[PDB]
Structure 1
Amino acid sequence: MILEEKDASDWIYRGEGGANLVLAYAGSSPLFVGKVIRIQKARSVLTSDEQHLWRENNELISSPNKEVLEQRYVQNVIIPLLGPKHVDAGVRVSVSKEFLECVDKKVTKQRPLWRVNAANVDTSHDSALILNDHSLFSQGSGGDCISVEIKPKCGFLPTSRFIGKENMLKTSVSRFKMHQLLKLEYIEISEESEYDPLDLFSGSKERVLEAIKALYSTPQNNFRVFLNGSLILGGSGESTGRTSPEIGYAFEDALKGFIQSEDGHRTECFLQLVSDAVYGSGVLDRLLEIQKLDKLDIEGAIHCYYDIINQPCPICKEELSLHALPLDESLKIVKEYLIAATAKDCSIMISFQSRNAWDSEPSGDYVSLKPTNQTFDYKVHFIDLSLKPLKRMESYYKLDKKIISFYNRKQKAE
């Protein structure tokens, strides 16, 4: 029930995002075998404005800590929306300060330096999240498991009435593609990614495959691959650089026996396998619907935000429409905007294993690889379904203004 100091040595770095540190269990305890632990970082549990926003979900507003908050957020808001088939809310577990402290230290050296600069484990939370490890095909075997993680980002184009005259490029150019230019400018990446989210979410099989090949070539922080829980393609707690021949070889070699093709051809077969799973599964259509809860764009939603927090709108100057909405409706719009923001920033994990004829109940989800003559069963889970803080509406607006006005400036340079 409680993780103490010495338990710390049975957990090993798995990765991290901007919000949580994730460790995988390497011990023997039947309690943790096949799990990861997800620990919130530090960069009362809900502002007053937030309790207003989440009023409809009381069990949410009365969450005693942040861990229970996320847990109930996923169970009560996200589940109802994506079904429970592809989602795990997690089980909370007591951790002690010294355990947390001990984990922080143990993994420090395996973290990107910049991640360590930005934040650490909040060693004041008394709880943490335990999740099923989706790099493991099933909880509690059918041989090896190749697991693929995709952070798809936003797969549609805003079409809002509320997009400003100087910003209409947002109407035709993906946010992900415009953001890439800024990141390069800010030395957050070394080269622009080849991935286009519009391809991946297109519903076109050839365009999904194109997205997958692109993710493979330039994974940044959008693509990872695991062999039985150990990373073989992608970044460790951060964006990785373009796939090089050295990385190409290492990954090709890691696939041996799993993709049963000739040496050198495994990679192409694996890419097709992922594509077939994504596409055939239809899992992205559902995610995309949630993303489209951002109905009005940040340029529209921001106006409702100031109404919700009762501040005169600094964006309007000396939109009669949005400002004439009843409070109830402004709340809805912003809540949906923040649900959409969860959807836009989560990941999909797709676990693969050789079709097991001895399954006592044969799986309905699988993929037959043309060439190899193999069948793989697969499973999809969504991960990283974090609650986004309402206050963040302000920076969403500024980051957006920054993205588009830099993209415009870059284009003007014809």
Structure 2
Amino acid sequence: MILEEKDASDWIYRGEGGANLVLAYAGSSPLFVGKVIRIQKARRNDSVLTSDEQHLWRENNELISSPNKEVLEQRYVQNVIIPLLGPKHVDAGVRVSVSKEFLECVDKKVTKQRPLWRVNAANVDTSHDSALILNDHSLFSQGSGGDCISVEIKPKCGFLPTSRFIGKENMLKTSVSRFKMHQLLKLEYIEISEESEYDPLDLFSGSKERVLEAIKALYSTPQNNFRVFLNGSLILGGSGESTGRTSPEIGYAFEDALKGFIQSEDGHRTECFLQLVSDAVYGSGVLDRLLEIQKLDKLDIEGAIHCYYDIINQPCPICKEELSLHALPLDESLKIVKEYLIAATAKDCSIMISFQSRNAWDSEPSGDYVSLKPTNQTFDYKVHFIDLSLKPLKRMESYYKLDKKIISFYNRKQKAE
């Protein structure tokens, strides 16, 4: 019911993004075995919903009357995302009461395993009385079948905008993925050391060869897009952050960690694992439905931003001294922006794919598996989406400014012919 200070020692750092700290359970309590706990951070840059937001999510009443942010996320996923992605690959999570000292002790306990820059930016909001308990998707099933190799992919946006509302100076956005353009900026801002090889357009292409190309690229330059876990412990990718190119040292360590699981010859396990992930992702069709949601961003931020100012009743600062978008009835403007924010969730979520050697003694043999040609192995697999966070309405403003910054920096770098 309530987590207490002394329970803190049973949770171990697992990872974090910009919004949450995620800890894996290491204790014995049948309650938490196979779970992770997801804990919101307080951003130092930064009651449950602004007035404009309650206006935005008016169709979803349970969601507007959430007594806290944990319940908000919980109801968002259950009532808005599920009906869109299906419930098979999604877990809304169960709330659990936490005491202030539990939070404080956890924050202090994991501090040293956290990236320095993540610590500078945010800490566990010790003013929340609740956290989220999720199933740990590095564990094959809730409640064994041997080891479990788990892969996390954060696919980003897999389509190009085609908007009538993209300015003349910015048409490159029509040609070059946002992920690719953003790479140049990050490099310029010293957030990464080398541009990623990953092309979201390949992963979402629907082509088996191109999906494998994406997976191979993810492997070489994982950044914050790719991680691999062996029974819940990280063996490739960054811990709470983006990581650098895969070096020979990293390649070897990863190759070794796969022994027994991928039953190929020493030195060849890695290529076999990459083929296995590719088959799993491609065969599950799971990316197609995600892409559909991402494409709820129909007009691009350059279009959607106009509706946003209408929704909040401010004169549009983007138009200066569109006859089209600003002539929309409140109802359509709210729809457009709400879908833009749902798309933003889909653009930033992750997929975790759990693998385990196919178990002949399952009482109902899974329909979902992949046959590895050479090794003569069959693996059952499961896919779950994670990090299906609700994006705050106010973020429409920085989405526009970030976008403007990406395209103009890219334009400038290109003009440097």
TM-score by length of 2: 0.99
1:246 deviation in Å? 0.3
**1:232 CA displacement:** 0.2
Mapped to 2, the partners of 1:318 and 1:46 lie a distance apart of 34
d(CA) in 2 for partners of 1:9, 1:246: 32
- Distance across 1 between alignment mates of 2:222 and 2:70: 30
Deviation string, structure 1 residues 359-388 (Cα, Å, up to 9, x no partner): 000000000000100000000000000000
> 1:162 deviation in Å?
0.2
CA drift of 1:169 comes to 0.1
Match of 1:325 in 2: 328
Shift of 1:91: 0.1
Q: Does 2:415 align with 1:376?
A: no
Aligned 1:254-403 pairs, distance under 5 A: 254-403=257-406
Query: What are the Cα deviations for residues 17-56 of structure 1, in whole angstroms up to 9, with x where unaligned?
Result: 00000000000000000000000000x0000000000000
CA drift of 1:270 comes to 0.1
Query: Post-superposition shift, 1:113?
Result: 0.1
1:284 to partner: Cα distance: 0.1
Cα deviation code 1:261-293 (max 9, x no counterpart)? 000000000000000000000000000000000
- Deviation, 1:83, is 0.4
**CA-to-partner distance for each residue in 1:126-152, whole Å, 9 max, x for gaps?**
000000000000000000000000000
Partner of 1:249: 252
**Residue aligned with 2:324, SS:** helix
Q: What does the per-residue CA deviation read over 1:333-378, in whole Å, with 9 as the maximum and x for residues that have no partner?
A: 0000000000000000000000000000000000000010000000
Distance apart, 1:245 and its partner CA: 0.3
Paired with 1:242 and 1:78, the residues of 2 have a C-alpha distance of: 34
Structure 1, unaligned runs of 5 or more: none
In structure 2, runs of 5+ residues without a counterpart are none
> What is the match of residue 20 of structure 1?
20
Task: State the distance in 2 between where 1:30 and 1:309 align.
Answer: 48
Q: TM-score, normalised by structure 1?
A: 1.00
Shift of 1:328: 0.3
Shift of 1:13: 0.1
Aligned counterparts of 2:388 and 2:122: Cα–Cα separation in 1: 20
Superposition deviation, residue 111 in structure 1: 0.2
Deviations 1:195-228 (A, max 9, x none): 0000000000000000000000000000000000
Corresponding residue to 1:97 among 100, 120, 125: 100
Q: For residue 5 of structure 1, report the CA deviation from its aligned partner.
A: 0.1
Q: Deviations over 1:68-90 (max 9, x none)?
A: 00000000000000000000000
| Cα separation, 1, equivalents of 2:343 and 2:367 | 30
Please report how far the alpha carbon of residue 158 of structure 1 lies from its aligned counterpart in structure 2 after TM superposition. Answer: 0.2
Q: Secondary structure at the match of 1:235?
A: coil
User: Partners in 2 of 1:141 and 1:87 — Cα distance?
Assistant: 21
How far apart in 2 are the matches of 1:199 and 1:287? 15
| Corresponding residue number in structure 2 for 1:35 | 35
The equivalent of 1:63 in structure 2 is: 66
Q: Do residues 236 (structure 1) and 232 (structure 2) align?
A: no
Matched residue pairs, number? 413
Q: Tell me, what secondary structure is at the counterpart of 2:180?
A: helix
3-state DSSP of counterpart to 2:137: coil
Tell me, what secondary structure is at the counterpart of 1:261? coil
Q: Structure 1 residue 203 and structure 2 residue 206: aligned?
A: yes
Q: Find the aligned partners of 1:192 and 1:26 in 2 and give their Cα distance.
A: 36
Task: Determine helix, strand or coil for the equivalent of 1:12.
Answer: strand
1:299 Cα deviation from its structure 2 partner:
0.1
Tell me the secondary structure at the aligned position of residue 320 of structure 1: coil
Q: 1:109 is paired with a residue of what secondary structure? A: helix
Distance in 1 (alpha carbons) for counterparts of 2:192 and 2:322: 37
Shift of 1:301: 0.1
